[PDB]
Amino acid sequence: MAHHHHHHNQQNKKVEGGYECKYCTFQTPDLNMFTFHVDSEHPNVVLNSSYVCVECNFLTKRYDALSEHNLKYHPGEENFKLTMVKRNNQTIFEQTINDLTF
Ligand SMILES: [Zn+2]
Ligand SMILES: [Zn+2]
Numbered sequence: 001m002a003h004h005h006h007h008h009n010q011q012n013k014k015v016e017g018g019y020e021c022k023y024c025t026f027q028t029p030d031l032n033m034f035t036f037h038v039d040s041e042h043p044n045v046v047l048n049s050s051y052v053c054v055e056c057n058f059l060t061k062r063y064d065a066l067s068e069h070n071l072k073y074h075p076g077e078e079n080f081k082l083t084m085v086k087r088n089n090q091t092i093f094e095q096t097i098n099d100l101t102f
Contacts, residue, residue, distance in 0.1 A: 031056065052066075
């Protein structure tokens with residue numbers, strides 16, 4: 001199919017500026033508000049496989065948000081690494097930077 005782009009608009013919020021949870025379509029650039037609403041609504045989340053910015057400890061529903069992350073969120077360079085270590089929660093791939101970690 002050539003594809004008819006239409007149904008994507010407002011379906012995908014992507015990630016704009018902040019921490020978008022994997023489990024919710026709400027986002028906040030405030031880590032406190034992020035972890036607050038997380039602890040409140042999704043304190044223990046376990047599922048299958050996803051990416052989290054280890055740096056920010058934020059799980060998102062798309063690997064993309066981690067990719068644009070060092071682009072806009074942790075700007076300076078673009079070099080993210082992947083490591084799967086997520087304890088208490090599920091085992092999900094945490095994506096850390098080798099530089100923008102500071
Ligand atoms: Zn959330
Ligand atoms: Zn981050």
